[PDB]
């Protein structure tokens, strides 16, 4: 009766789709009318970070929002400084291939990951001052896409195999292994309360996980190409999703549906990094056509163009307070907008 | 200057770090990076062993030139989402087994993979050093069975030289661009000694091409 089982599963999927249709009442664009449009957005360059000598793949901010972390093509993980233009550290990675970087919310540790299928965590506030490998987390099969720090002892990971794992820095073996996906997973973003997160796999589906229980909570379809980046809304009950279809999509947690589509005919190249600006009214998006965007998160109309790079933008993210934006493109430059 | 005493030392340390990265980039950018794609368990081990988890590198220097053979075929993931990391490699050592035409056939699967990796938009100027191994096994199997079983287009005779030429033309015709990149074939074998010499010759050719393009003389 396995055929009956799979057909019943398909019928249940049709039923949940019908429930989603019924749960729909209106559109976010329809709701947000009679509201003041954001208007033109002019965001000049405020800093440039001309330290790297190759491509730049990832970026993260500290809690104080003054120290950058940049994953390069040649392993040269740098901890920059924001207000001035210096280099607090320069970490020579073991494997040059690094596709993610994460700076711990406590300012102590920093992580990196790439094709080596190993996430290495570096310690900074060390007596006998020198950045050293605190732990080489291993256990993933495919490549590694994004790591994020819950605290100074736990870290989450989205790998190249169809899994996302919650690690343990003290004892290098995994605590939980989230597995509900099909195809590789490219990005993930933790909650502002560090209780839930979603990972965007290439199967055009995003899943809502739960760190404690370990079981998947919700699913999020509605796309046409593979997801490339996700960052929760500052509220903690929504998340945008990067795409290869050049279609940012703002999902939500209590309606489980898809709210808005930030798609225009002019844009055709894919998305690389999406980061909500603080207070949520701006949805940044690093495209492939050497150009970012300042998409108005409530009204579909774009607010402004943010383009000063000469090659593909590969990472971006707003400060903690919301004072600046740090783009890292495939060139050797990080640009601090404000 | 209105820079405090500690901030001045911070700037000095930042400049020292800048110098360190500049020196590292100078010493490492001249180094030669040879990506190795192809079909695993078909001669990769033999060719690697000839020259003395996930990705694995191999830093061997021959005739005073530091090489980096990057065996990435063991990644076992989506080949289109991590291949862009390998832009800027000076070569792509492909690997085909002449005996793997009698096992969707694996020979035509390897042909498809070769076509996909040659025509990829990330690798348009980077050369490809095609390899062909199992010479003795191919000789035995061409003495045993004909070449038409896997090749419907072929119509000649089951002679080793003609078949080898046919394979050369076939694998050097699947490239849609014959101007921006070259393909260096080589009928190596298991017990071989000249593969490192041939790879050195090909890498000298490609580095001469890169020098000509950089200087703008081309």
């Amino acid at each position, epitope marked *: 009766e396995l055929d009956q089982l799979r057909q019943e599963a398909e019928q249940l999927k049709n039923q949940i789709r019908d429930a989603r249709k019924a749960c729909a009442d209106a559109t976010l664009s329809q709701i947000t009318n009679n509201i003041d449009p954001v208007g033109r957005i002019q965001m000049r360059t405020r800093r440039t970070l001309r330290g790297h000598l190759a491509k730049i793949y990832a970026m993260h901010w500290g809690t104080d929002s003054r*120290l950058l972390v940049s994953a390069s093509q040649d392993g040269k993980l740098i901890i920059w*400084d924001s207000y001035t233009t210096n280099k*607090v550290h320069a970490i020579p990675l073991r494997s040059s291939w690094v596709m993610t970087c994460a700076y711990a919310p406590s300012g102590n540790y920093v992580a990196c990951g790439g094709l080596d299928n190993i996430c290495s965590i570096y310690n900074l506030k060390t007596r*006998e*001052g020198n950045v050293r490998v605190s732990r080489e987390l291993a256990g993933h099969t495919g490549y590694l896409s994004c790591c994020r720090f819950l605290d100074d002892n736990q870290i989450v990971t989205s790998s190249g195999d169809t899994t996302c794992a919650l690690w343990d820095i003290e004892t290098g073996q995994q605590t939980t292994t989230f597995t509900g996906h099909t195809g590789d997973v490219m990005s993930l973003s933790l909650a502002p309360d560090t209780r839930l997160f979603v990972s965007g796999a290439c199967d055009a589906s995003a899943k809502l996980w739960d760190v404690r229980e370990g079981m998947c909570r919700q699913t999020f379809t509605g796309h046409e190409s593979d997801i490339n980046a996700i960052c929760f809304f500052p509220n903690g009950n929504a998340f945008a999703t990067g795409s290869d279809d050049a279609t940012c999509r703002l999902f939500d947690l209590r309606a489980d549906q898809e709210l808005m589509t930030y798609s225009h005919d002019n844009i055709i190249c894919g998305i690389t990094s999406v980061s909500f600006s603080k207070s949520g009214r701006l949805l940044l998006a690093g495209y492939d056509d050497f150009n970012c965007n300042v998409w108005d998160a409530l009204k579909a109309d774009r607010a402004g163009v943010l383009a000063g790079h000469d090659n593909r933008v590969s990472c971006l993210g707003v400060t903690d307070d919301g004072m600046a934006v740090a783009t890292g493109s495939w060139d050797s430059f990080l640009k601090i907008w404000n | 200057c*209105t820079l*405090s005493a*500690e901030d001045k030392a*911070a700037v000095e*340390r930042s400049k020292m770090i800048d110098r360190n990265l500049r020196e590292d980039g100078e010493k490492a950018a001249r180094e030669v990076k040879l990506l190795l794609l192809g079909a695993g368990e078909s001669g990769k081990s033999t060719i690697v062993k000839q020259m003395k988890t996930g990705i694995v590198e191999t830093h061997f220097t021959f005739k005073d030139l530091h090489f980096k053979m990057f065996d990435v075929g063991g990644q076992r993931s989506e080949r289109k989402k991590w291949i862009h990391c390998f832009e800027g490699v000076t070569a792509i050592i492909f690997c085909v087994a002449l005996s793997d035409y009698d096992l969707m056939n694996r020979m035509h699967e390897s042909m498809k993979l070769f076509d996909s990796i040659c025509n990829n938009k990330w690798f348009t100027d980077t050369s490809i050093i095609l390899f062909l191994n199992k010479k003795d096994l191919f000789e035995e199997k061409i003495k045993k069975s004909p070449l038409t079983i896997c090749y419907p287009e072929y119509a000649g005779s089951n002679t080793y030289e003609e078949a080898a030429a046919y394979i050369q033309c076939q694998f050097e015709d699947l490239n849609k661009r014959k101007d921006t990149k070259e393909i260096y074939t080589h009928f190596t074998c298991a017990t071989d000694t000249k593969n490192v010499q041939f790879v050195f010759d090909a890498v000298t050719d490609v580095i001469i091409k890169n020098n000509l393009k950089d200087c703008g003389l081309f």
Partner: single-chain antibody
Framework: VQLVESGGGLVQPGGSRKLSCSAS????????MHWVRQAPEKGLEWVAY????????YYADTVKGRFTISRDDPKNTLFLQMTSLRSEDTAMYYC??????????????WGQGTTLTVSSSDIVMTQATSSVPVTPGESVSISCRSS???????????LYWFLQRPGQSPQLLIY???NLASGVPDRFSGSGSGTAFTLTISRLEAEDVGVYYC?????????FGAGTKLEL
């Protein structure tokens, strides 16, 4: 992780010596190093400075052109050669390590050091307290003073606090104003405003007694303070 300054004794005045401090267990290249001396019963005197790679060197007023300091990076030693020692430069010296980046903590570890005996526009810091009595358990505060406003335009105010137990090398406590050095209890808390600062002690134990030298780092030659002796 440890510094031992060696070389010294009783040389005749106007002689010449070269000191040494065999660094072993930290990034000697990456950490800038200083030299601080102590008279028989006076306060600490800043002497010299070497940065990472010897890119910038500073000297005190009384040693400019007389003393010379260099680092031997491969050998892990640091040298302070001396020319024309007067009869007023008798002191037992300290080999200081330091580091400078955003959020660093200079003067964190201070070597035990060796002695040296010879026969026969300054940022003022006046520590008015001197041999102040205190009962073990009660909360007291060490006063401080200055003349040039240390509240720089870049926010942080550069001024430090160095406790010294008797017969022991001094240690960093507060690597800026209102911070806390690693391995220093939360009982201590810098609390100041502008150009008059205090060092609160929540409840002193039987071990946190001695002199609390408060030193400014806004501009060289890093004038120290007179210190405040602590008692029972």
């Amino acid at each position: 992780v440890q510094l031992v300054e060696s070389g010294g004794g009783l040389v005749q005045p106007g002689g010449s010596r070269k000191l040494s401090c065999s660094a072993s267990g930290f990034a000697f290249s990456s950490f800038g190093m200083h030299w601080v001396r102590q008279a028989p019963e006076k306060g600490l005197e800043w002497v010299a400075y070497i940065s990472s790679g010897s890119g910038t060197i500073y000297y005190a007023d009384t040693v400019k052109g007389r003393f010379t300091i260099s680092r031997d990076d491969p050998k892990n030693t640091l040298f302070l050669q001396m020319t024309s020692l007067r009869s007023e430069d008798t002191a037992m010296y300290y080999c200081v390590r330091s580091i400078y980046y955003y959020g660093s903590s200079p003067f964190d570890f201070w070597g035990q050091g060796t002695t040296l005996t010879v026969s026969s526009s300054d940022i003022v810091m006046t520590q008015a307290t001197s041999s102040v009595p205190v009962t073990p358990g009660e909360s007291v505060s060490i006063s401080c003073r200055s003349s040039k406003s240390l509240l720089h335009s870049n926010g942080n105010t550069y001024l430090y606090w160095f406790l010294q137990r008797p017969g022991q090398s001094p240690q960093l406590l507060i690597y800026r104003m209102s911070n806390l050095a690693s391995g220093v209890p939360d009982r201590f808390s810098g609390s100041g405003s502008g150009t008059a600062f205090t060092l609160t002690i929540s409840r002193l134990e039987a071990e946190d007694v001695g002199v609390y030298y408060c030193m400014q780092h806004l501009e060289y030659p890093l004038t120290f303070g007179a210190g405040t002796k602590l008692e029972l």
